[PDB]
Coordinates of N, CA and C and ligand atoms in Angstrom, one line a residue:
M1 N -34.4 -18.5 2.4 CA -34.0 -17.2 2.8 C -32.7 -17.2 3.6
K2 N -31.7 -16.6 3.0 CA -31.1 -15.4 3.3 C -31.2 -14.5 2.0
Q3 N -30.4 -13.5 1.8 CA -29.1 -13.2 2.4 C -28.2 -14.3 2.2
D4 N -27.4 -14.7 3.2 CA -26.0 -15.1 3.1 C -25.7 -15.8 4.4
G5 N -24.4 -16.1 4.6 CA -23.8 -16.1 5.9 C -22.5 -15.2 5.8
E6 N -21.5 -15.7 6.4 CA -20.1 -15.4 6.0 C -19.8 -14.0 5.5
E7 N -19.2 -13.8 4.3 CA -17.9 -13.3 4.1 C -17.4 -14.0 2.9
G8 N -17.0 -13.3 1.8 CA -16.2 -13.9 0.7 C -14.8 -14.0 1.3
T9 N -14.5 -15.1 2.0 CA -13.2 -15.4 2.6 C -12.9 -16.8 2.2
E10 N -11.9 -17.1 1.3 CA -11.0 -16.1 0.7 C -10.1 -15.4 1.6
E11 N -9.3 -14.5 1.1 CA -7.9 -14.4 1.5 C -7.4 -13.0 1.3
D12 N -6.1 -12.8 1.3 CA -5.4 -11.5 1.4 C -5.5 -10.9 2.8
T13 N -4.6 -11.2 3.6 CA -4.2 -10.3 4.7 C -2.7 -10.2 4.6
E14 N -2.3 -9.8 3.4 CA -1.0 -10.1 2.8 C -0.6 -8.9 2.0
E15 N -1.4 -8.5 1.0 CA -1.0 -7.4 0.2 C -2.2 -6.4 0.1
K16 N -2.4 -5.7 1.2 CA -3.4 -4.6 1.3 C -2.6 -3.3 1.5
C17 N -3.0 -2.3 0.7 CA -2.6 -0.9 0.8 C -2.8 -0.5 2.3
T18 N -1.8 -0.2 3.1 CA -2.0 0.2 4.4 C -2.6 1.6 4.5
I19 N -2.5 2.4 3.4 CA -3.0 3.7 3.3 C -4.5 3.7 3.2
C20 N -5.0 2.9 2.2 CA -6.5 2.8 2.0 C -7.0 1.8 3.1
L21 N -6.1 1.1 3.8 CA -6.4 -0.1 4.6 C -7.3 -1.1 3.8
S22 N -7.0 -1.3 2.6 CA -7.8 -2.1 1.6 C -7.0 -3.0 0.8
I23 N -7.6 -4.1 0.4 CA -6.9 -5.2 -0.4 C -6.5 -4.6 -1.7
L24 N -5.4 -5.2 -2.3 CA -5.0 -5.0 -3.7 C -5.4 -6.2 -4.5
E25 N -5.1 -6.2 -5.8 CA -5.3 -7.4 -6.6 C -4.1 -7.7 -7.5
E26 N -4.0 -8.9 -8.0 CA -2.8 -9.3 -8.8 C -2.7 -8.6 -10.1
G27 N -1.7 -7.7 -10.1 CA -1.4 -6.9 -11.3 C -2.1 -5.5 -11.3
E28 N -2.6 -5.1 -10.1 CA -3.1 -3.7 -9.9 C -1.9 -2.7 -10.0
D29 N -2.2 -1.5 -10.1 CA -1.2 -0.4 -10.0 C -0.8 -0.3 -8.6
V30 N 0.5 -0.7 -8.4 CA 1.1 -0.8 -7.0 C 2.5 -0.2 -7.1
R31 N 3.2 -0.2 -6.0 CA 4.5 0.3 -5.8 C 5.1 -0.5 -4.7
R32 N 6.5 -0.6 -4.6 CA 7.2 -1.2 -3.6 C 8.1 0.0 -3.0
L33 N 8.3 -0.1 -1.7 CA 9.1 0.9 -0.9 C 10.2 0.2 -0.2
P34 N 11.3 0.8 0.2 CA 12.5 0.1 0.6 C 12.3 -0.5 1.9
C35 N 11.5 0.0 2.8 CA 10.9 -0.8 3.9 C 9.7 -1.5 3.4
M36 N 10.0 -2.5 2.5 CA 9.3 -3.7 2.1 C 7.9 -3.7 2.5
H37 N 7.2 -2.7 1.9 CA 5.7 -2.7 1.9 C 5.3 -2.4 0.4
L38 N 4.0 -2.8 0.1 CA 3.5 -2.8 -1.2 C 2.2 -2.1 -1.2
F39 N 2.0 -0.9 -1.8 CA 0.9 -0.1 -1.7 C 0.3 0.2 -3.1
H40 N -0.9 0.7 -3.2 CA -1.3 1.2 -4.5 C -0.4 2.3 -5.0
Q41 N -0.1 2.4 -6.3 CA 0.7 3.5 -6.9 C 0.1 4.9 -6.5
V42 N -1.2 5.0 -6.7 CA -1.9 6.3 -6.4 C -1.7 6.7 -4.9
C43 N -2.1 5.8 -4.0 CA -2.1 6.1 -2.6 C -0.7 6.5 -2.2
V44 N 0.3 5.7 -2.6 CA 1.7 6.0 -2.1 C 2.3 7.2 -2.8
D45 N 1.8 7.7 -4.0 CA 2.2 9.0 -4.5 C 1.9 10.0 -3.5
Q46 N 0.6 10.1 -3.0 CA 0.2 11.0 -2.0 C 0.9 10.8 -0.7
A47 N 1.2 9.6 -0.4 CA 2.0 9.3 0.8 C 3.4 10.0 0.8
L48 N 4.1 9.7 -0.3 CA 5.5 10.2 -0.5 C 5.5 11.7 -0.5
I49 N 4.7 12.3 -1.4 CA 4.6 13.8 -1.5 C 4.2 14.4 -0.2
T50 N 3.4 13.7 0.7 CA 3.2 14.2 2.0 C 4.4 14.2 2.9
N51 N 5.1 13.0 3.0 CA 6.3 12.8 3.8 C 7.0 11.5 3.3
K52 N 8.2 11.6 2.8 CA 8.9 10.4 2.3 C 9.3 9.4 3.3
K53 N 8.4 8.6 3.8 CA 8.8 7.5 4.7 C 7.6 6.5 4.7
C54 N 8.0 5.2 4.8 CA 7.0 4.2 5.0 C 6.3 4.6 6.3
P55 N 4.9 4.7 6.3 CA 4.2 5.5 7.3 C 4.3 4.7 8.7
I56 N 4.1 3.4 8.6 CA 4.3 2.6 9.8 C 5.7 2.5 10.2
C57 N 6.6 2.3 9.2 CA 8.0 1.8 9.5 C 8.9 3.0 9.9
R58 N 8.5 4.2 9.6 CA 9.3 5.4 9.8 C 10.5 5.6 8.9
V59 N 11.1 4.5 8.3 CA 12.2 4.5 7.4 C 11.9 5.4 6.2
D60 N 12.9 6.2 5.7 CA 12.7 7.0 4.5 C 12.6 6.1 3.3
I61 N 12.0 6.6 2.2 CA 11.8 5.8 1.0 C 12.3 6.5 -0.3
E62 N 12.7 7.8 -0.2 CA 13.4 8.5 -1.3 C 14.6 7.7 -1.8
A63 N 14.4 6.8 -2.7 CA 15.4 5.8 -3.1 C 16.4 6.4 -4.0
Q64 N 17.6 6.7 -3.5 CA 18.8 7.0 -4.3 C 18.5 8.1 -5.3
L65 N 18.0 9.2 -4.9 CA 17.9 10.5 -5.7 C 18.3 11.6 -4.7
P66 N 19.2 12.5 -5.1 CA 19.6 12.9 -6.4 C 18.7 13.9 -7.0
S67 N 17.5 14.3 -6.4 CA 16.6 15.3 -6.8 C 15.8 15.8 -5.6
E68 N 14.6 16.2 -5.8 CA 13.8 16.9 -4.8 C 12.4 16.2 -4.8
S69 N 11.5 16.7 -3.9 CA 10.1 16.1 -3.7 C 9.7 16.6 -2.3
Ligands
ZN101 ZN1 -4.5 2.4 -1.6
ZN102 ZN1 7.7 -0.5 5.2

């Protein structure tokens, strides 16, 4: 008897969506923003449309457009 101990640990404190505060996986739907963070594509859509900046970093992310949003 258990149960368990631990934790599937294992790794990633490296590429987690800061918006979901959750891990990503290798080849998942992701995005890169100019202040060098890597988020889910879905989460960061909603991030951008809410306000175009890396949320922690404050730097804008509307990369060289030229349009609206
Ligand atoms: Zn996410
Ligand atoms: Zn950033």
